[PDB]
Amino acid sequence: ANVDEAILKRVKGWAPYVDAKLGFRNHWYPVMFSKEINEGEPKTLKLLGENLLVNRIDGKLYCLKDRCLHRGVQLSVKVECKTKSTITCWYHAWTYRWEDGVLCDILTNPTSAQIGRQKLKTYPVQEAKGCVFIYLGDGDPPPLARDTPPNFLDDDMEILGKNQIIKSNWRLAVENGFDPSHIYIHKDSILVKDNDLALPLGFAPGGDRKQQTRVVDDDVVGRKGVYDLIGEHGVPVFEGTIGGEVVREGAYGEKIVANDISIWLPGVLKVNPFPNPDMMQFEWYVPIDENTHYYFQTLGKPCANDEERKKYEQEFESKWKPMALEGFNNDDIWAREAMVDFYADDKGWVNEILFESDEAIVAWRKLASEHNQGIQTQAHVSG
Amino acid sequence: ANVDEAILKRVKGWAPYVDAKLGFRNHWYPVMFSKEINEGEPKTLKLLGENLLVNRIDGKLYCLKDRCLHRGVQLSVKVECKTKSTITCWYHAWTYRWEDGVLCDILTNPTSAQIGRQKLKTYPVQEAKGCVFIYLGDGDPPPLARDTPPNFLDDDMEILGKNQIIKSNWRLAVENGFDPSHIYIHKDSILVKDNDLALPLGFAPGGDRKQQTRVVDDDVVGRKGVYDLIGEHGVPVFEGTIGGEVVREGAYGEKIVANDISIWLPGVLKVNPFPNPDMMQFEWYVPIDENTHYYFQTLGKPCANDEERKKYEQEFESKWKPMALEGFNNDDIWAREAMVDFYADDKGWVNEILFESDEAIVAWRKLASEHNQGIQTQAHVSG
Amino acid sequence: ANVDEAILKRVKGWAPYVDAKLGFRNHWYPVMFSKEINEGEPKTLKLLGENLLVNRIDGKLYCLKDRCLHRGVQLSVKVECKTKSTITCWYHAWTYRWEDGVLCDILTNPTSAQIGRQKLKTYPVQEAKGCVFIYLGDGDPPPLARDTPPNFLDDDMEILGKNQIIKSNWRLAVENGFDPSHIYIHKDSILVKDNDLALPLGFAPGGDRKQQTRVVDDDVVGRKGVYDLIGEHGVPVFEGTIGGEVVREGAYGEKIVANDISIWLPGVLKVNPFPNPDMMQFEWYVPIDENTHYYFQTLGKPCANDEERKKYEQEFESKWKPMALEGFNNDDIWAREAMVDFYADDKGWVNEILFESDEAIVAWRKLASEHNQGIQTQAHVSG
């Protein structure tokens, strides 16, 4: 639906994934933090190519398509919320209920035949762990757990994070996250030095192809993902050689991190533990449009009470956000940006030359192709 | 030519209008004020996607296509008018007569077989009320009055105006101008408050007078237009309601304006009276290219002598230009800009949901489709 | 390959040239001066649409495609030359030999089956006369002499020059260089005024079409070019007339230059003598992409020894660079930029109206169509 059929015929291992330039419809995605949306302060964002409005009304979140039914303007150009329960388009005052999107009033013509006979698209919205998730899909949503990595929703897991807009397609971000050999780019990170991490340059893979990953397609809340098992039977590379000479060494530190690495539909990485042995990292790559993603980064730590939560918040602000979320992952940002040109014409999916550690990436591409809940298309965006 | 047949086949009754992305050929259009084009000082502009040169020679205006026949450069890159009657291309000195476009000389090769056997396109130009009009069409032009609204050319009518380039397609500007319900956007205007205008939020169409428009096809100079009668025959909304609760009032005021509102081919609105009881507003939305128009605004006031003309100019500079042309119509500008996205892929023409007051807009779309004098195409532009 | 088949059918005689939007493959092209690339300091550039890296190692130049075989990143985003003889991709440390492009190591997986089984594209590089030439083509190259004008490689010919990036297609540059009538644009040049040049406004051609040029398809080293002979039979125009009135004169200077003007594949102009009677100008119009070229200008003067070399370097800096390479050719730069719009859609090749002096340009388009060593296509650029 999105890519030249002639390219899709050349990527038969994972053609639906290559078609999914706008992401997968009918999944939950995080778009902002709960603390960023105040009572009665609607916010605009673009998700899977669609402009949306989110509002908090008596503490509850609601999501309306930011596109008037009448002349297709963004209501957000000039927000008019004239009652708690409604928003009025600024142009001809078509008025919609947040709760169900029904056209309930038109201020410029209270006799219109359109009143009560039209509905603006709404999307389900849930807050969990101080994160705002939108179900960009149609019909009854699944539990949020389906589209979140294991442990993210644990009662005692405290989540703190950072969000920003990155100019690469979401898939280049997912693959960069889940790529076992990309950790070469992190060899000079401040985090690796100041937090004393064991970080190899890469891994010489051991065992058979089928042992390099574990597909999870039998999780009982319907979660679908892949674990990277390259470190299980693989030999970590700490001495980089050219023609047999050592030219580079890996990070010779004491702290073992990233024993468990997994990627989940719709596009969320879990790294456990990271960036410290007592915490884990969960990061989403949320499709905004064909060219752009939200890099929605979270660190989780079990905290038993308000005192542990406060101690974690203080370490997050003082150490883990600047050292790890910024000082380690900033190199991922320009890596993603560097892949844009090759994949921009959809040709890089045919012309890439993969090697052994990309087994993790190919397993993800297949999992995503088989288990996605729909391919978002320009028809969903416009129609 | 300009729009996919898949869209046009879905808009029967006004498909020519939807195809007319670049405007209608074979009409007059205003492009600048007389004072902006000085004797022997050529000016460049783009009209209906064509680059044009205008010059004043012995007081009279001429217009050549700003594209050399030879290698297709704009002559205006380096203007060389070496005699009163001619322009010489800067590149190889092909020399054209302003009066008829004829290639009369080539300075680089006075023996060329091209001399006297080629002609650069010319367009008629006329000045009226201090406004420069170009006939962007072929063959001998109709009278200017065919393409101007009633009274604009009246002997006593003093015209003052403002012109600027706006980044929307021309049709979004025309529809914004003629839209009976869009007056909702003007509810907070300083003009409405300070000049004591009566301005409803909108109109409930009137049950005792069923015809919401009057087509003028029967005019004496052949002008073609539509009068909006909703406001004359409708029930004005001064108390806008949501769930039956008043959430917004209209503007009460002594001064009744816009008794008669009409749109005319090729795309010029007349509002009478406006912004004061003895004035009229005439505004054009002149196509520059697919994405851009001139918003050519004028205010007319009958003036018997130089003292009345002087008083009107003072009034215009101190009050009407800042309060009305800027203050009031600035909200029309961002309204037009806000419609761009929905119409940019041509899908808005199919996906819009109209309501009752849009009968005025559909009447215009059908009038324009029936009585335009030609659809401008890329073949006219490049060629 | 590059242009709508419809257009190519309307230009039959020179269709391969109209197709050659990215330039001709399997030719040498200058891209920088020798003194701009230091030992072990790689430089990036784009040539015929391909991103390339050039390095100097033990004084010798090497050229690798700047696109990793693995995920298609530019290695130049973060250059890692970890041994004298190699470059390591910053992403997964795929390590390539400069000499033959062979993938000789991967630091992230020294056990990979890809090692020794892949090679990055390399291009030959040759330095001559202080200029860096890349053979943008396949297989063992021809002698550089084939792709340089006569006398450029003469033992005693001292070359000095200037390079810059210009926003036009390379062919608009070539035609502007070789066009006999375009000298009209140079009539006010500081070089003409200050160096007392004789410069007509143009020529009235004499003799047959065949007599207006001399095709060199028969040169001993395989050079392919056209001499402009318009001034052999041609009558110089020094009095430009409109309606038989003189409106402009040529330059009546004592100094005679540009006796011999020739254009050579792959797109290099030779003007002898210029800008003074014992110097030659050799200038290349090197394709960067569809929209861009290097304007690689050089001035040659024969010098017997180190002392003549130094005097020429001084007059180049104080006189010839500013007065000629800038004061004369700057008008050529904006002339090229002015042709972009008409040729951007490929329609100008069909819609232009040529005149008699364009027989030089037609002879070049025919020579280029017949004798080019290959049409660069998006398949070469992409894969």
Ligand code: FES
């Ligand atoms: S575009 Fe929203 S009410 Fe008209």
Ligand code: FES
């Ligand atoms: S482009 Fe105008 S005379 Fe050649």
Ligand code: FES
């Ligand atoms: S992209 Fe260069 S080594 Fe992976």
Ligand SMILES: [Fe+2]
């Ligand atoms: Fe990373």
Ligand SMILES: [Fe+2]
């Ligand atoms: Fe308005």
Ligand SMILES: [Fe+2]
């Ligand atoms: Fe020149």
Ligand SMILES: [Mg+2]
């Ligand atoms: Mg709801």
Ligand SMILES: [Mg+2]
């Ligand atoms: Mg005329």
Ligand SMILES: [Mg+2]
């Ligand atoms: Mg009032």
Ligand SMILES: [Mg+2]
């Ligand atoms: Mg008055």
Ligand SMILES: [Mg+2]
């Ligand atoms: Mg080599």
